[PDB]
Short mmCIF file of C-alpha atoms and ligand atoms in Angstrom, two decimals:
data_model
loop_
_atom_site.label_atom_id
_atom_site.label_comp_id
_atom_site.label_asym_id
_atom_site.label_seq_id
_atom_site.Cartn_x
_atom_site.Cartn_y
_atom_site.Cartn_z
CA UNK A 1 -7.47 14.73 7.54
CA UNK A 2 -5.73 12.04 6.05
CA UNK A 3 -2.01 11.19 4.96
CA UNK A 4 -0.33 14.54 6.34
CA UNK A 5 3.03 15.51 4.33
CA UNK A 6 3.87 17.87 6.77
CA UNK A 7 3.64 14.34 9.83
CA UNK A 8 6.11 12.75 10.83
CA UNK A 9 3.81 10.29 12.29
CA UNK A 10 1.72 9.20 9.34
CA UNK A 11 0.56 4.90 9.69
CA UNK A 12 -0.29 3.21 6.57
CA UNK A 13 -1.91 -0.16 6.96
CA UNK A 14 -3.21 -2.64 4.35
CA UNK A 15 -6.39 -4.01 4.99
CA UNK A 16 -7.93 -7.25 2.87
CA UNK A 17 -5.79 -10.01 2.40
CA UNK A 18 -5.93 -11.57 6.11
CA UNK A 19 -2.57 -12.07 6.71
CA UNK A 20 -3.70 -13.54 10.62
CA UNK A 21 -5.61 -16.29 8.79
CA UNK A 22 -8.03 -17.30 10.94
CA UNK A 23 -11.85 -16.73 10.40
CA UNK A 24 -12.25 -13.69 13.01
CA UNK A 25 -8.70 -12.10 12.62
CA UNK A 26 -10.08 -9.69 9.99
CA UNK A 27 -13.21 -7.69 10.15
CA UNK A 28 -14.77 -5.46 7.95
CA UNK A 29 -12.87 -2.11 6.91
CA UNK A 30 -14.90 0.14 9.10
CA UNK A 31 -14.23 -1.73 12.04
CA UNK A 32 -10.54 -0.49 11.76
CA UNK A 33 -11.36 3.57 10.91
CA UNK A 34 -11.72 4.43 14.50
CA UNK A 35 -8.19 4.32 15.12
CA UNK A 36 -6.46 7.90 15.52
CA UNK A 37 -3.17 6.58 14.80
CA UNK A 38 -4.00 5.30 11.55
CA UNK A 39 -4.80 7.45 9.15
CA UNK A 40 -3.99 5.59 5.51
CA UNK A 41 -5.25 2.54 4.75
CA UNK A 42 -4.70 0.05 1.77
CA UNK A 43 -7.51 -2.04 0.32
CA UNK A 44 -5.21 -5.38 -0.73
CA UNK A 45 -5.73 -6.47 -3.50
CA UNK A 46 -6.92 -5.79 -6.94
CA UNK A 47 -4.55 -8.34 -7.95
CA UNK A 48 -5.90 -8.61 -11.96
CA UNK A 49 -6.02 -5.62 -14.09
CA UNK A 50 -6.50 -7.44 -18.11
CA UNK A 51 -8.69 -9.66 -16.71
CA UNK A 52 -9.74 -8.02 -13.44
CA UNK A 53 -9.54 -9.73 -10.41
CA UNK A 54 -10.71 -8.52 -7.25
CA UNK A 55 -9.06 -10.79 -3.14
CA UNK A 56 -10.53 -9.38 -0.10
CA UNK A 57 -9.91 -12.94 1.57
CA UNK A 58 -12.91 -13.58 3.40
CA UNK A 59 -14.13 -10.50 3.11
CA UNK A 60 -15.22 -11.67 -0.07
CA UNK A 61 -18.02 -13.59 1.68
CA UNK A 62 -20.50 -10.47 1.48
CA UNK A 63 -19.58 -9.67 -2.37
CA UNK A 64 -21.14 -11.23 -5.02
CA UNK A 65 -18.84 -12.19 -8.35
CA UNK A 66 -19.99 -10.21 -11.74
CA UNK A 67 -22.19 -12.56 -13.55
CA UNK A 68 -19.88 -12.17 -16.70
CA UNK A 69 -16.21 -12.40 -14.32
CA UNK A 70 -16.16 -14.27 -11.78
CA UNK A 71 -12.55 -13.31 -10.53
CA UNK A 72 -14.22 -9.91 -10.15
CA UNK A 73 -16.46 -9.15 -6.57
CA UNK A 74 -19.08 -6.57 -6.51
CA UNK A 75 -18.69 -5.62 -2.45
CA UNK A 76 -21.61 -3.69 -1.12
CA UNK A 77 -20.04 -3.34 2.57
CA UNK A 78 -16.61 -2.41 0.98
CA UNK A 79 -18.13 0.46 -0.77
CA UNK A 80 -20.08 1.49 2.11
CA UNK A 81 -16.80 1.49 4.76
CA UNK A 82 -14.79 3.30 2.05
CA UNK A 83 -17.47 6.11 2.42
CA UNK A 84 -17.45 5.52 6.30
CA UNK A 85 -13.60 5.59 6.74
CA UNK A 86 -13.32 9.18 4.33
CA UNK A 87 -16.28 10.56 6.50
CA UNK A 88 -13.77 9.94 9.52
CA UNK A 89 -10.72 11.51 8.12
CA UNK A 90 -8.83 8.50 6.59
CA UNK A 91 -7.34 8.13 3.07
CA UNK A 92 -8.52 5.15 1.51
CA UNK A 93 -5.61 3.59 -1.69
CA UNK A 94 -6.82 0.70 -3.95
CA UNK A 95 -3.55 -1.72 -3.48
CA UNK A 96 -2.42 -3.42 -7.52
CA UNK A 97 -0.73 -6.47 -7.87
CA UNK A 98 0.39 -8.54 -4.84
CA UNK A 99 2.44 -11.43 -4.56
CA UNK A 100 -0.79 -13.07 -6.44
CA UNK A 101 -1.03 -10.91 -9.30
CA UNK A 102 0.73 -13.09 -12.40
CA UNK A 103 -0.59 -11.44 -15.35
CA UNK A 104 3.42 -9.96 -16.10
CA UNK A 105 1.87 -6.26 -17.17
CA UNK A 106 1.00 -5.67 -21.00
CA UNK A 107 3.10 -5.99 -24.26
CA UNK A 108 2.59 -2.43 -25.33
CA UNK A 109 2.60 0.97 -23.98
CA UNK A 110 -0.91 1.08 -25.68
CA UNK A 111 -2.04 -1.76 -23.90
CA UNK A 112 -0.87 -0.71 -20.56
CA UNK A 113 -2.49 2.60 -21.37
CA UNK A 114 -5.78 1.23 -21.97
CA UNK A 115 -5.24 -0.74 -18.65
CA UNK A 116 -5.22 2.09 -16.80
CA UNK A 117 -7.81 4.01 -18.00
CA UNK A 118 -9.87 0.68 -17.22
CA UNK A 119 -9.04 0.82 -13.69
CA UNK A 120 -9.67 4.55 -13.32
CA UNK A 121 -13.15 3.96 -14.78
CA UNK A 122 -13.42 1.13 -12.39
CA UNK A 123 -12.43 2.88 -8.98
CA UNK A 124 -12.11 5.88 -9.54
CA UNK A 125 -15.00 8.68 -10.33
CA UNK A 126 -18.40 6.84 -11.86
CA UNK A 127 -18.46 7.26 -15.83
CA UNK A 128 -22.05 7.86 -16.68
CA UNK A 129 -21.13 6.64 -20.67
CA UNK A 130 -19.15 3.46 -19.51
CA UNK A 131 -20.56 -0.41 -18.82
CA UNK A 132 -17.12 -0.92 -16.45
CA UNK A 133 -18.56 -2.48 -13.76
CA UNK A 134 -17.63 -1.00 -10.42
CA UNK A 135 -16.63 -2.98 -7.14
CA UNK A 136 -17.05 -0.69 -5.02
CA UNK A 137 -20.09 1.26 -6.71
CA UNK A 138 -20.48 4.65 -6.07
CA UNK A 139 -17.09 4.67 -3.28
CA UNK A 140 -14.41 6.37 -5.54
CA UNK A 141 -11.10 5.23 -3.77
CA UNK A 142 -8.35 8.34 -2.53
CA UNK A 143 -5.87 6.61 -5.19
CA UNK A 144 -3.71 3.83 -5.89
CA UNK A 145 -0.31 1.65 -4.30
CA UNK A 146 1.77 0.17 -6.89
CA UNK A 147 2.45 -3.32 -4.96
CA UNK A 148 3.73 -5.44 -7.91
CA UNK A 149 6.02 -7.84 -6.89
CA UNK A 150 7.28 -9.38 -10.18
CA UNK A 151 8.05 -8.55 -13.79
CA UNK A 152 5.60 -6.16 -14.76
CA UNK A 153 5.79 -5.14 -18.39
CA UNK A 154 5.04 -1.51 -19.25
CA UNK A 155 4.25 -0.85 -15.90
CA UNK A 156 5.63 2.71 -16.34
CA UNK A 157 3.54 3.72 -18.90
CA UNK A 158 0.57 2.32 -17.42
CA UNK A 159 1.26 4.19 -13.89
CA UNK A 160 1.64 7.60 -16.15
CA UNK A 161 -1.74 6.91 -17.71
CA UNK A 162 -3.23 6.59 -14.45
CA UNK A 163 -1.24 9.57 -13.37
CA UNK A 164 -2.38 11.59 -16.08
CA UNK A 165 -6.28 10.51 -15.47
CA UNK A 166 -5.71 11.52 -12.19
CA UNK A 167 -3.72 14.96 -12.64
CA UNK A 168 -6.29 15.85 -14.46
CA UNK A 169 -9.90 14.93 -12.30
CA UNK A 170 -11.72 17.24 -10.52
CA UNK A 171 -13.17 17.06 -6.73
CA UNK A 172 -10.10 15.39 -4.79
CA UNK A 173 -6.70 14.86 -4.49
CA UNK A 174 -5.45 11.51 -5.54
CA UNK A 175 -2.39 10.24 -4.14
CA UNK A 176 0.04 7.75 -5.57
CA UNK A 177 2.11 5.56 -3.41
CA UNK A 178 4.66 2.53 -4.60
CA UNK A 179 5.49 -0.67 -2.07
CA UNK A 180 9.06 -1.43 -3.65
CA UNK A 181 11.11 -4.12 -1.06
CA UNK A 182 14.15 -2.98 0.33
CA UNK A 183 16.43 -4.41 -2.09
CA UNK A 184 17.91 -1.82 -4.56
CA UNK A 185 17.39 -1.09 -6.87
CA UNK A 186 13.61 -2.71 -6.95
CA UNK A 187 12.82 -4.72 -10.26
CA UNK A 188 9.01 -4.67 -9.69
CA UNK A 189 8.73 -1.34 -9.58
CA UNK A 190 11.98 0.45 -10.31
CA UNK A 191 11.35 1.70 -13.76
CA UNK A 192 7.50 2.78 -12.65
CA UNK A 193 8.89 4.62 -9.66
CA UNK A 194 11.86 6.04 -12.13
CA UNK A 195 9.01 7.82 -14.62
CA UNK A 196 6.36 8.46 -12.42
CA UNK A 197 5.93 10.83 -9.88
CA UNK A 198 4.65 9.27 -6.52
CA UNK A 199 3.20 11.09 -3.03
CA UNK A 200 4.92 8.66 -1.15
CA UNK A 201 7.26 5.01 -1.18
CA UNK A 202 6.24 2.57 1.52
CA UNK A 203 9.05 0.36 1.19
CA UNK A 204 9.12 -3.54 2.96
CA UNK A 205 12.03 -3.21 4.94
CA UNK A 206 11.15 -7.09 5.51
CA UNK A 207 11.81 -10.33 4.06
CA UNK A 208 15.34 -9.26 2.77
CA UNK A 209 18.56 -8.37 4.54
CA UNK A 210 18.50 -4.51 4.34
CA UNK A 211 15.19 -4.79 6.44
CA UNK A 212 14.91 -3.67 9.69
CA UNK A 213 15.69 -6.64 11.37
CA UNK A 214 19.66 -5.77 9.91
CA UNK A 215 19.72 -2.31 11.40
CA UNK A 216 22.70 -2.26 14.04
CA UNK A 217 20.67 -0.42 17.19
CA UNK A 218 23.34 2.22 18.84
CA UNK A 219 25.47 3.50 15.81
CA UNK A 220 24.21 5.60 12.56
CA UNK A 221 27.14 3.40 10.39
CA UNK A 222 24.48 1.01 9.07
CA UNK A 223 25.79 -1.73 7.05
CA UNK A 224 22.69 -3.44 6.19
CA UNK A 225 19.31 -1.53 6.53
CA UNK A 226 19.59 0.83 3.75
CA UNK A 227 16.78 3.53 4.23
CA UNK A 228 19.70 6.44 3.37
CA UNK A 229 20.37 4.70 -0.04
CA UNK A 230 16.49 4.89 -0.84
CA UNK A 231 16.71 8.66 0.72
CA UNK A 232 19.61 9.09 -1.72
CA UNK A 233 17.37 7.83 -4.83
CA UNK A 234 14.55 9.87 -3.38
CA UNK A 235 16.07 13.29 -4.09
CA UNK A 236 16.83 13.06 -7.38
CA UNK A 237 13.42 10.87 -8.21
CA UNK A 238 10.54 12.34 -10.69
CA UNK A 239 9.10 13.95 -7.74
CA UNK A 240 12.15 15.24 -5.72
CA UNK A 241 9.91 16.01 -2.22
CA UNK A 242 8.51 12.46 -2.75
CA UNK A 243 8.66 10.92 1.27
CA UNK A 244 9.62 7.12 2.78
CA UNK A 245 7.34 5.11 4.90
CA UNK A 246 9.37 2.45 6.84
CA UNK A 247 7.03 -0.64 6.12
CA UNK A 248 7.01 -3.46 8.81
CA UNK A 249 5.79 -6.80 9.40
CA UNK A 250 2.67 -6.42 12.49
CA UNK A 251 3.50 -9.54 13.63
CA UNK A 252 6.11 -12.10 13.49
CA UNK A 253 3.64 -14.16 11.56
CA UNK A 254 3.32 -11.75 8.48
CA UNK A 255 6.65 -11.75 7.11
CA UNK A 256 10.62 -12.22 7.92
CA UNK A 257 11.90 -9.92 10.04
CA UNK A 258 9.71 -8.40 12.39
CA UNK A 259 11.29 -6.09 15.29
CA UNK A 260 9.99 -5.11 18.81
CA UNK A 261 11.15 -3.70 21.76
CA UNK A 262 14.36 -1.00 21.57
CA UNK A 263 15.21 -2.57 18.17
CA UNK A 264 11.72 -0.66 16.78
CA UNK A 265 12.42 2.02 18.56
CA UNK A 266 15.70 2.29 17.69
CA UNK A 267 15.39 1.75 13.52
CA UNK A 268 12.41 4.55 13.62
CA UNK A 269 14.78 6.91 15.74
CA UNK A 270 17.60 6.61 12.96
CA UNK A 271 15.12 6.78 10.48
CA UNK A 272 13.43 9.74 11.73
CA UNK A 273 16.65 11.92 11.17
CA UNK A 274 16.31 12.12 7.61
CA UNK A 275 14.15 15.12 5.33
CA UNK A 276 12.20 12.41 3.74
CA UNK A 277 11.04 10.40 6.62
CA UNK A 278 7.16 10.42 6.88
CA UNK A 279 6.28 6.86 9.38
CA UNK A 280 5.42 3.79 8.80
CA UNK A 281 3.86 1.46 6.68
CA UNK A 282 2.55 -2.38 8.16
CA UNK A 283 1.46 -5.77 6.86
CA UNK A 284 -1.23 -6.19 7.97
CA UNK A 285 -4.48 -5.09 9.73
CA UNK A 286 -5.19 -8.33 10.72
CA UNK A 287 -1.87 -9.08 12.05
CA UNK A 288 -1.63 -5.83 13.69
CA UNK A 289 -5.05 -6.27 15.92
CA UNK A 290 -4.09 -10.00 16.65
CA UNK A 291 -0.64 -8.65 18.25
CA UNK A 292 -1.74 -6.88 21.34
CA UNK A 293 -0.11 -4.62 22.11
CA UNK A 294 1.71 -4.36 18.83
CA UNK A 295 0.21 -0.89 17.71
CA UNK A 296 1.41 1.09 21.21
CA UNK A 297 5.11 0.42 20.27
CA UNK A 298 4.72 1.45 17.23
CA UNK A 299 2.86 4.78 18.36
CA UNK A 300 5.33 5.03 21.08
CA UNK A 301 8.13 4.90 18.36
CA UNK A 302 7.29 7.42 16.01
CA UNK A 303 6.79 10.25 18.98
C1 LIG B 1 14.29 -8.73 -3.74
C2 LIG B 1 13.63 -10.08 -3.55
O1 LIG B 1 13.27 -10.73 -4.52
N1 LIG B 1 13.48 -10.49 -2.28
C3 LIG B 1 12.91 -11.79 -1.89
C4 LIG B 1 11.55 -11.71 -1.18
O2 LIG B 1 10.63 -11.07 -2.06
C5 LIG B 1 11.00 -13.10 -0.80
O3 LIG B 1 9.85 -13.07 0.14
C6 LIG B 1 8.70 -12.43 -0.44
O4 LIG B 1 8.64 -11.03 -0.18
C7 LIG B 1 7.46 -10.36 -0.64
C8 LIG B 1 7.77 -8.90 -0.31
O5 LIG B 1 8.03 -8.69 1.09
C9 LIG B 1 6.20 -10.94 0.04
O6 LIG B 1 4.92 -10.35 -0.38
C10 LIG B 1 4.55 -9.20 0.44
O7 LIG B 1 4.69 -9.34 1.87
C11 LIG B 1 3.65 -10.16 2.39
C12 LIG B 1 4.29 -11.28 3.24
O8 LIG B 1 5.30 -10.83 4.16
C13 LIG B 1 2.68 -10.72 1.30
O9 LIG B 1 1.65 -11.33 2.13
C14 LIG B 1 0.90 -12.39 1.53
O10 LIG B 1 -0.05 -11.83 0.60
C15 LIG B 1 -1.00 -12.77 0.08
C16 LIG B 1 -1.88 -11.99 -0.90
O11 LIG B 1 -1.11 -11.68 -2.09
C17 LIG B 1 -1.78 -13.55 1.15
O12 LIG B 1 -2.30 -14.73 0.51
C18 LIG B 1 -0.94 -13.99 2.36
O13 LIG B 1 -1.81 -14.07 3.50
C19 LIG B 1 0.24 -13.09 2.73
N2 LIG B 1 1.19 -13.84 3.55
C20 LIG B 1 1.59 -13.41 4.74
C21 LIG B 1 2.46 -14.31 5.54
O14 LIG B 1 1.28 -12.34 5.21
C22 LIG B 1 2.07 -9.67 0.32
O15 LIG B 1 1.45 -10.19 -0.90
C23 LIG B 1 3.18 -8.68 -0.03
N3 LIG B 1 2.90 -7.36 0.54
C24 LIG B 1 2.81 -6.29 -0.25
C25 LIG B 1 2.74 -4.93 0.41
O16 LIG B 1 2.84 -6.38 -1.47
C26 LIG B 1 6.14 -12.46 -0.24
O17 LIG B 1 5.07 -13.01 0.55
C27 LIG B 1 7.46 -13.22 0.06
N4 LIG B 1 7.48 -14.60 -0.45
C28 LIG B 1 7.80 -15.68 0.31
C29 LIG B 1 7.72 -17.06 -0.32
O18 LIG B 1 8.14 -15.57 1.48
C30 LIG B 1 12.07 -13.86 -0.03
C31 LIG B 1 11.61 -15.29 0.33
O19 LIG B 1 11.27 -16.04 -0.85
O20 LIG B 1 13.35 -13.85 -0.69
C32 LIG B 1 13.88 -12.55 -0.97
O21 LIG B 1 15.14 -12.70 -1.63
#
């Protein structure tokens, strides 16, 4: 049934941007929503909003661009795995921004505003009065990961439009997650994750010195991994039962600092002693299935 607040055992994975890099390292998202263990996924990455633009790396091979945006993919097979994977009990996010996204956010809080109600008519519940087209057609996504990894003007405001649209639909729950890095406080998404309530923070404990490649296996004085300063933030945050996924690189390929052996055992151990701990978050599905092998440890770790 999906992310599980009450797990602590919950896997998110993004799916779409190929981190592996090689021309059968990724397969369509349904291949991946027979896996028990994972039960949250991330579609990576609508990384254009004002324009919209639409990666799926070579997944984008069976879309075909909007006649009138070309940056934008209209993904037949997308929409029909999103359907697939909800059918088999997984929660399906739309990923914004990326380390590709550039467009620095909007100028005004009205701007940002109208943003957001763009992208809820785009992915979220068909509009029968709007001419939005839709990526993903009839699929309406389980809700949105704030993954902006630069300046990102107004960003707040435009989360709490999205939050409101959301708060307020029928049918579903929606759930809002944020992929800060480790460093804090995070300027990408500090201010966003300072207004607006969110389900859950996957935060990259990778490519920076508090990952989990600086946690000191054998002693709960940690000096460098700093997953009890983000617990400390995460009490007193807009939603004060919010919970922390410990993100990951899947393979030593897909970002600095990926663990193994006792050392990712160890780090999800200590991590797995504090109230806010909820599992972990990887980069990426590709690199995940290419590492065999990769996946049991991290199972293994989280029991
Ligand atoms: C606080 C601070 O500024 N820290 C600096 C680091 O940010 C910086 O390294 C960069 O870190 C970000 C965050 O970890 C990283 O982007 C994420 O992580 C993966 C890579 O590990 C990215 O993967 C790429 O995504 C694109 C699509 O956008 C693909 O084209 C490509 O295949 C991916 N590459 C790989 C190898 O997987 C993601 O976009 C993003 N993930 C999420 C969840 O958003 C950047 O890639 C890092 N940049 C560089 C140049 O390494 C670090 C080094 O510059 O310095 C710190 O100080």
């Amino acid at each position: 049934a999906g992310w599980n607040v009450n797990s602590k055992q919950n896997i998110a994975v993004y799916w779409g941007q190929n981190s592996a890099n090689s021309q059968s390292t990724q397969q369509r998202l349904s291949f991946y929503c027979n896996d028990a263990n994972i039960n949250v996924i991330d579609i990576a990455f609508l990384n254009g909003i004002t324009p919209p633009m639409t990666n799926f790396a070579n997944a984008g091979d069976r879309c075909t661009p909007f006649s009138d945006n070309p940056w934008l993919l209209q993904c037949p097979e997308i929409e029909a795995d999103i359907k697939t994977c909800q059918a088999n009990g997984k929660t399906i996010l739309l990923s914004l921004g990326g380390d590709s996204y550039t467009q620095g956010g909007w100028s005004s809080t009205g701007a940002a505003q109208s943003a957001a109600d763009q992208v809820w008519a785009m992915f979220g519940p068909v509009q029968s009065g709007s001419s939005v087209h839709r990526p993903f057609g009839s699929a309406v996504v389980d809700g949105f990961d704030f993954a902006f990894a630069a300046t990102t003007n107004n960003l707040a405001a435009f989360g709490a439009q999205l939050k409101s649209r959301t708060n307020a639909a029928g049918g579903k729950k929606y759930y809002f997650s944020a992929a800060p890095q480790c460093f804090f406080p995070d300027a990408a998404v500090g201010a966003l994750i300072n207004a607006v309530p969110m389900d859950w923070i996957q935060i990259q404990f990778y490519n920076n010195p508090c990952g989990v490649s600086g946690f000191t296996p054998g002693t709960s004085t940690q000096n460098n991994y700093n997953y009890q300063t983000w617990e400390n933030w995460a009490k007193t945050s807009p939603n004060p039962n919010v919970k922390l996924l410990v993100g990951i690189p899947a393979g030593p390929g897909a970002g600095r600092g990926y663990v193994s052996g006792s050392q990712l055992t160890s780090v999800f151990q200590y991590s797995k002693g504090f109230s806010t701990f909820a599992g972990a978050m990887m980069w990426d599905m590709s690199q995940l299935y290419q590492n065999t092998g990769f996946e049991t440890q991290v199972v293994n770790a989280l029991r």
